[PDB]
Amino acid sequence: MTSITAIFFDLDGTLVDSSIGIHNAFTYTFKELGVPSPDAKTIRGFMGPPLESSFATCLSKDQISEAVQIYRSYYKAKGIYEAQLFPQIIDLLEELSSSYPLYITTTKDTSTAQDMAKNLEIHHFFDGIYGSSPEAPHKADVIHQALQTHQLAPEQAIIIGDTKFDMLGARETGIQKLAITWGFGEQADLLNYQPDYIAHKPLEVLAYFQ
Template identity: 30%
Template sequence: MHILFDLDGTLTDSRPGIINSIRHSLAENQLTVPEADALLWCIGPPILESFRKLVGPDQPHLFDPTVTKYRERYSETGIFENEVYPEIVDTLAELRQLGHTLHVATSKAEIYAKRIITHFELDRFFTSVNGSELDGTRADKAELIAHILLQQGISPAEAVMIGDREHDMIGATKNNLPAIGALWGYGTGKELMESGATLCARVPHLLPEMISSLE
C-alpha cells in the first residue's frame, strides 16, 4: 500500500516555528500580533491562504511583505523549531517492514519539507517528499494528492492519506482515497470525521493495524 503522510501536525510538531515566524512577520509589518494560541488555525492550511486571512482584504499591499518576512525567519530559524512526534519513527519503520511505500504529502513548500525530512533523518523511510511551489502551486491538498498519484503511478485503490486537518481528509476524498485522521495533531476528531475521515488514530502506533484493515 502507498501511504501518504501530511507533515505539520502529523509527522512533526511544527507549532513553535510556524507561530513564531508568523508573529515575527506581523510585527515587522506593524500589524496586530495575536497571541500564539490564537494562531493554531494556521497550522495545516497553505501558508499563503493563512496570510490572506491575517492581512485581510483592506490591506492587500501588505500581503507580499508579510509572506516575505515570514519566509525569511522560517527558512533560517523556524524550520528547526520543530520536533518529531513520539512513536513516529518506530511506526514508519514498522510500516516499511510490512512492505508499505511511504510518501510525504504536505501543503508546505516542497523546498522546506525536504529540508525538514532530511534534518530529522526521516528521509530513509520515504520514497518521495512532495509539497507545494513557493507561488502556491499544489498547495491545495486535493491537487497535491492528484499530482503524487500521477507522478508515482499509484492507483487510488492502493493508497491512503494520513493527516491531522480537514484539508487532508477533503483532499483524499476528492481523489477517492481512504483517509486516517491523526488525532495527535491540530485537528479535532469532529473536524476530521465531518470532513471525510475513514478512521481516526489516537496515537501513531495504531496506524499499521488500521491500514491493514483498509487493504
C-alpha cells in the same frame, strides 16, 4: 485496508511538530509589521491553511504579500529548525515502512519538505517526497502527482493527515483518509469528512493495517 499498497503522509502537524517555528515565524512577522500578535490558539488555527489566507484574517490586503515575504524570511533561516517529531513517529514509520512504500504529500514547498525530513532524520523512510509546485498548488494536485508518478490507482493509497485539507484532498482524488488528532487540526472538523480510520496516538495507526 487490503487494497492499500501505498501510504501517504502529511508532514507538518502529522509527522512533525513544527508548531514552535511556525508560531515564531508568525510573531516575527507581526513584530516587523508593528501589529499586535494574535493569541496562541488563533496562531494554532494558522497551521494548515494557506499563509495568504491566514494573514488575510488579520492584516490589510495590501500588506499580505509583504507579510508572506517576511514570514518566509524567518521560516527558511530559523523556523524550519524549530521543529521536532511527534512522540512515537519513528516507531510508526519503522513499522509501516517494513510493509509498505511510504510517501510524503504536503503543501509545504517540495524543497522545504525535503530539507525538514532530512533534518529530523526521517527522509530515509520515504520512497518519494512531494510538496507544492506549479504542477501541484494544492493538496489534491500533490496527491495526484504522487499517485501518477508511482503508477497507483487511488484505491491503492491512503493519506494519514491532521487537517480538513488532507480530508478534502483525499475525497477529491478518491484515496482513503486516516484522520489523526495529535496534531494541528481539530477532531470535530476531521470527523465531518467521514475518515476511514482515526487515531489519537501514532501506534493506533498500525491496527488499521492489521
